């Protein structure tokens, strides 16, 4: 059979303070189309169904921001995928360099995330 009622699925969502799109899990259906989202950094907010993306392994050739363990932040384009023991990775071509970043280290600018709401949106 199919997966359960959103609550438990790994997805990507818009942080509600008119921000960008960050990876997380649905924790609960808040109501009326809002679902509570635990972002992978440990944060939680309510997000409307349109603003949550559940068929979103970050598409290659899409533009994204990338973050390093030494705290650096810049933007580039997905051009590969990796799996490591139980987690997911993305090769980002950033400043002309194909560099491996984490699921949660690859963050979607709001205008990128819009192009995904249409196809991947819960709403």
């Amino acid at each position: 059979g199919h997966m359960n009622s959103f609550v438990g699925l790994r997805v990507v969502a818009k942080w509600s303070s008119n921000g960008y799109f960050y990876s997380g899990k649905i924790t609960r259906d808040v109501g009326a189309g809002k679902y509570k989202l635990l972002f992978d950094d440990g944060y939680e907010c309510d997000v409307l169904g349109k603003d949550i993306l559940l068929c979103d392994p970050i598409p290659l050739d899409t533009e994204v921001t990338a973050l390093s363990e030494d705290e650096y932040f810049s933007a580039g384009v997905v051009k590969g995928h990796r799996k490591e023991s139980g987690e997911l990775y993305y090769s980002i071509e950033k400043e002309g360099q194909r560099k491996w970043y984490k699921r949660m280290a690859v963050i979607l600018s709001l205008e990128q995330g819009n192009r995904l709401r249409e196809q991947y949106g819960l709403g």
Binding site: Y20, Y22, Y43, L67, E71, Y72, F73, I107
Partner: peptide, 12 residues
């Protein structure tokens, strides 16, 4: 000072 974007300048 810091080196990170909008919200992800979290405690770690």
């Amino acid at each position: 000072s810091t080196s990170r974007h909008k919200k992800l300048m979290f405690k770690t």
